[PDB]
């Protein structure tokens, strides 16, 4: 009963520390975060798409974040080590692909143009299919929704959970708020670097007689 | 549909702020020789600057609150 109580408390730290990166790191486009807590330097690891801006400049962003994470957790400074890495493929990260729509919609480019660009990137990346939905006040007083489907996508059961990546972002505008949803279906690779290693249970291949 | 509360009673007045002029100079006396005659009492931890607040049964410090 006591060992269950500890694992809950470190996760509420994780929920608060995730939404800081969604507010502070729009410029460089983080992909994820990972926290290691059971070592003497407790490890914060960040996967950002553009790490060459940070270590090339050597700004305070490596250090200002380092002071906050220890003072939040009441640990003294120089007890946390922050490690920065790259992201492998920019097309498969739906947080970066949805962030680009937040930039493009602010320059008054219409939504049919902005949705048509994000489908072309993942076709070069190699994903099998995507799904972008736009919803809200698009043309006046009444609201509607438009979805733009490319490729194939599976949305049922547990093997759906290994093969999709979705995210919800919103854009504020001068009249109303517009919701933005993006899904990305990851392709198979048995290396494990790019996608899930295991295979689909529907597809059954038969060895030749030889 | 909340509205302003109209009170049939007027406002109860607040006491006005006072400040005594040259209150710090009262603690010293000036002789005709030009020397200073000190009458107020300085607390033992803070003998250099601060004066003790003169009450009838108590002597009070404004910095440390030492009571005598």
């Amino acid at each position: 009963n006591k060992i269950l109580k500890k694992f809950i408390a470190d996760g509420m730290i994780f929920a608060e520390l995730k939404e800081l990166f969604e507010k502070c790191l729009i410029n460089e486009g983080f992909s994820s975060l990972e926290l290691r807590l059971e070592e003497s330097p407790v490890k914060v690891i960040l996967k950002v798409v553009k790490p060459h801006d940070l270590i090339g400049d050597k700004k305070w962003k490596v250090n200002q974040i380092q002071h906050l994470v220890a003072s939040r957790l009441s640990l003294p400074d120089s007890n946390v080590v922050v490690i920065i890495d790259k992201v492998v493929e920019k097309g498969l990260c739906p947080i970066y692909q949805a962030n680009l729509i937040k930039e493009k919609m602010l320059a008054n480019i219409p939504h049919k143009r902005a949705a048509n660009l994000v489908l072309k990137n993942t076709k070069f990346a190699g994903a099998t299919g995507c799904l972008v939905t736009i919803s809200g006040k698009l043309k006046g007083l009444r609201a509607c929704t438009k979805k733009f489907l490319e490729g194939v996508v599976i949305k049922s059961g547990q093997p759906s959970r290994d093969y999709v990546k979705k995210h919800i972002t919103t854009v504020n505008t001068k009249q109303g708020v517009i919701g933005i949803q993006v899904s990305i279906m990851l392709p198979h690779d048995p290396e494990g670097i790019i996608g899930p290693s295991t295979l689909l249970p529907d597809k059954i291949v038969v060895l030749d007689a030889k | 549909n909340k509205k302003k509360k109209a009170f049939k009673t007027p406002k109860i007045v607040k006491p006005a702020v006072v400040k005594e002029k040259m209150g710090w100079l009262k603690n010293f006396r000036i002789g005709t020789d030009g020397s200073v005659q000190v009458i107020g009492k300085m607390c033992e931890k803070c003998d250099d600057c601060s004066f003790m607040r003169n009450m009838k049964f108590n002597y009070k410090c404004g910095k440390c609150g030492l009571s005598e």
């Binding site: 009963n1 060992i3 269950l4 694992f7 809950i8 290691r36 059971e38 | -």
Partner: protein, 96 residues
């Protein structure tokens, strides 16, 4: 020397076993393997943020796996393995 393994997924506690069983039993000292049954937390909650529609409930869960070793050894024979066999996601609180 009671030492325990506490995890969140099955796959991490498996690869730590055959790495530890070959290194600790075959080389220096004996040991005992002990796996504890799982402990489950249940938070039954109502779905909608309203009281209008048909009232449905959902049950969330979180599982903890426990495998404990009971070893009696010399001093540095177990403590060299803590520095050597520290794996990445799992916790291993060692009680000497």
């Amino acid at each position: 020397v009671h030492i325990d393994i506490s995890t969140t997924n099955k796959s991490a506690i498996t690869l730590a076993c055959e790495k530890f069983e070959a290194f600790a039993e075959n080389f220096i000292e004996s040991l005992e393997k002990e796996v504890l049954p799982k402990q489950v937390g249940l938070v039954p909650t109502l779905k909608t943020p309203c009281g209008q529609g048909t009232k449905t409930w959902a049950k969330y869960k979180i599982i903890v796996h426990q495998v404990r070793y009971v070893i009696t050894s010399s001093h540095d024979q177990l403590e060299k393995v803590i520095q050597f066999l520290k794996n990445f996601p799992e916790i291993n609180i060692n009680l000497g």
